[PDB]
Every structure is written in structure tokens, then in C-alpha cells.
């Protein structure tokens, strides 16, 4: 009986209407991929009781082993997983950087699309911010513990505030995507994440770079990553920010999943 399903003419696939926000659904598949690995991020990462295909029990916190055992069937999630596989090429770390960062770019993109900003304009902002991040990263081995993620966010947020036009909305959200990584370290350590971001921005406002999250259960304060000896690799952050943005942009460019047959 009419009116049936709207915009459904290709093999009866689940085509979300204009009200159902087909783009919003492919993003939700990627956000769920981050929550499966957002908790395993950092030294206090939570282990996963993985059950192998041979009915074998393994308790681990490695991202590559989680995804290799988790049969990811959604194609929108496979793209981010393919970036993790491409992350393994040219570097052997930063896998969860691709999952956590890309999940924040897509999660924050929904706040822009909901306002009414076009998906093609959101992509131009992330591509501009990725190019801007590669110029700021040499100025920052780089500090870890979420230190670069706040400074790189602070430097990119200022570029978006002075840049007029519509690209500033996606450029600012590109900076807030970096904040998800300190928020992951704080949540996995049992600390109010908003208090970590508030302190990390204050010390960076005073110019105290190289300051990261002090990993401690009973101390939500911060410390210098240089004095403690915590350091990350430059190419690990370079190729992670690059592949994560391409995976997020590649998902945003897609608006409809369609079946086929040879």
C-alpha cells in the first residue's frame, strides 16, 4: 500500500531518506568502530576478551588484533580499517590514532551537516587543516601524552578564527578532533577529561609546550613529557593525520551504499 519506501529502487537496499540522513548512518558505523578501540588507547588501555575464530580465548589490547578478529562488515568502517592497514606501511604504530581521530572528524562533521553546511565544504576544511597541521608539526621526535594534540589544535584553531568564510567551521572542528586523544587517555585513566583539556590549554596559553597528561589515578594534573622522557615519532603523527583525514574525507564523499552483481 502506498506511500511505500522513498528512494528505494536498487535491489531493495536500505536507502535512508532525506529525513533519515544517509550520511549520518555511515558515520555511526565509524563511531562504533572507535568505541571498540577508544578504551584501549594509552598505557592504561583496557584489554579485550577476544574470542578467536577457532574458539580460542585471548585477552589483549592491541588494535590490529582487535580488528583482525572483529569481522568488520560495514564498508564505511572498512575504509578506516584500510587506513589502519596503510598505517602499518611506512610506520608500525599510531593505529588507534587513525580510529580515534577519524571517528572524531566524522562525529564532529555531523554537527556541521546538521547546521546545513555542505559535505563538499566540510571536506575542503579538513584538507586545509591537514595541510596546515603538516606545517605546524615540524615546529613541535615530538612530545606525546596528548601534548601535540592540544598545541596542534591550538595552532589550527587560531588559523580558523582569522580565516574568513565557511571553511572555518570545519577547520575549528578539525582542532577539536585532536582533543579526543587526550580525552581518551584521561577516560582510560579514570580522570574527568574536561579538566585535563582545561589544564593542558592553560599551560599552552602560557607557552609551556611539551606538556602532556600525567598518567596517574589519584592525580589529574599534568607534567612535562620532555622531563619524563615520553616522546612520539614525527612520521607516526604525520602519516596518521594524513591517512585519517583521507579516510574521513573518503567516507564523507560517499552518500549512498548500493549493491551490485557481476
Amino acid at each position: 500500500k502506498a506511500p511505500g519506501f522513498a528512494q528505494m529502487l536498487k535491489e531493495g537496499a536500505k536507502h535512508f531518506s532525506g529525513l533519515e540522513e544517509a550520511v549520518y548512518r555511515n558515520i555511526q558505523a565509524c563511531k562504533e568502530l572507535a568505541q571498540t578501540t577508544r578504551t584501549a588507547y594509552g598505557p592504561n588501555g583496557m584489554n579485550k576478551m577476544v574470542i578467536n575464530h577457532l574458539e580460542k580465548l585471548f585477552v589483549t589490547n592491541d588494535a590490529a588484533t582487535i580488528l583482525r578478529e572483529l569481522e568488520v562488515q560495514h564498508p564505511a568502517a572498512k575504509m578506516i580499517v584500510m587506513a589502519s592497514h596503510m598505517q602499518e606501511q611506512e610506520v608500525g604504530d599510531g593505529t588507534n590514532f587513525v580510529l580515534v581521530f577519524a571517528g572524531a572528524l566524522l562525529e564532529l562533521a555531523e554537527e556541521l551537516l546538521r547546521i546545513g553546511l555542505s559535505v563538499s565544504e566540510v571536506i575542503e576544511g579538513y584538507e586545509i587543516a591537514c595541510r596546515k597541521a603538516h606545517e605546524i608539526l615540524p615546529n613541535l621526535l615530538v612530545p606525546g601524552g596528548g601534548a601535540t594534540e592540544i598545541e596542534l589544535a591550538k595552532q589550527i584553531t587560531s588559523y580558523g578564527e582569522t580565516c574568513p568564510g565557511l571553511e572555518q567551521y570545519a577547520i575549528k572542528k578539525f582542532a577539536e578532533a585532536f582533543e579526543a586523544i587526550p580525552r581518551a587517555l584521561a577516560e582510560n585513566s579514570g580522570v574527568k577529561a574536561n579538566e585535563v583539556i582545561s589544564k593542558l590549554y592553560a599551560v599552552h596559553q602560557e607557552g609551556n609546550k611539551n606538556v602532556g597528561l600525567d598518567i596517574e589515578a589519584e592525580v589529574p594534573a599534568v607534567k612535562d613529557m620532555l622531563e619524563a622522557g615520553i616522546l612520539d615519532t614525527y612520521l607516526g603523527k604525520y602519516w596518521a593525520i594524513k591517512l585519517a583525514t583521507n579516510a574521513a574525507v573518503t567516507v564523507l564523499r560517499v552518500d549512498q551504499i548500493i549493491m551490485a552483481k557481476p
Binding site: 583496557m46 569481522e71 579514570g190
Partner: protein, 134 residues
């Protein structure tokens, strides 16, 4: 049509930990009455109908082979204690489920699991130091 799980059953957060805490208490109840020399016996029947009566905690866990994921952790830990020592599997099994029971209401109140681990790692070393001193 297009879903992420497609048979992949998964749950996360506080409900998963609370589910494992309750599953660990089941292994405790199976060896709770056998603690001590005068502990109650346990009757176990294999597939062939052959009976097995024994009040040893280690022998009981070998015959159960519980399929729950969290329960296998205690069984493999208790089995290792039997191979290395041959005694104390019931004390290890009961204390583990009891550490989990006491922190159960705090986990429900929003206390992070990692803060609980720092307490066990801290309280354990203080206890081991008190044993050698006394």
C-alpha cells in the same frame, strides 16, 4: 540489511564488568563449601554416568570446564596454582570472587575499573610485606 555486527555479539562498559563479576561468583559457590578439612563433598557425573565424589577444590574445577569467558580466567589461574603448589586453589578462587564482589557496588556508582586495580596492586604489596614482617 547493512549492519555492523551481523552475528558479532558484543557489549561494553559497566554491564560487561558486572556480568563477569557475577559469573565469577558462580565458580566460588561451586567450591565455597569445600574449604577446610571438614568441608562438604561435591558429586560430579561425567557423560558416561560415572560418579565422582571429592572435596578437593582443584579436582572440582578440572571436571567442570565452564564455558563462560570470565570463569575460565579463574580456572586457569587456579589450575596453575595446583600445578605449582597443589594447594590453595579454593583460597585463590574465593578471594578473587570476593575482591570482585566488594568492589561491585562501587563499579555501579561510576568508579573507574583502573582506580580499583591500583588499590589491589597497592594493598597486595602491603599485605605481602606484612606477612614477612610478622
Amino acid at each position: 540489511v547493512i549492519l555492523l555486527k551481523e552475528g558479532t555479539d558484543s557489549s561494553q562498559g559497566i554491564p560487561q564488568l558486572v556480568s563477569n563479576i557475577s559469573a565469577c561468583q558462580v565458580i566460588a559457590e561451586a567450591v565455597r563449601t569445600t574449604l577446610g578439612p571438614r568441608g562438604m563433598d561435591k558429586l560430579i557425573v561425567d557423560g558416561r554416568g560415572k560418579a565422582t565424589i571429592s572435596n578437593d577444590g582443584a579436582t572440582i574445577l578440572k571436571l567442570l570446564d565452564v564455558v563462560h569467558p570470565a570463569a575460565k580466567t579463574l580456572v586457569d589461574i587456579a589450575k596453575s596454582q595446583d600445578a605449582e603448589v597443589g594447594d590453595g586453589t579454593t583460597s585463590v578462587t574465593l578471594l578473587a570472587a570476593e575482591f570482585l564482589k566488594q568492589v561491585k557496588p562501587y563499579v555501579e556508582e561510576g568508579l573507574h575499573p583502573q582506580i580499583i586495580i591500583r588499590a589491589f596492586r597497592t594493598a597486595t604489596q602491603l599485605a605481602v610485606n606484612k606477612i614477612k614482617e610478622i
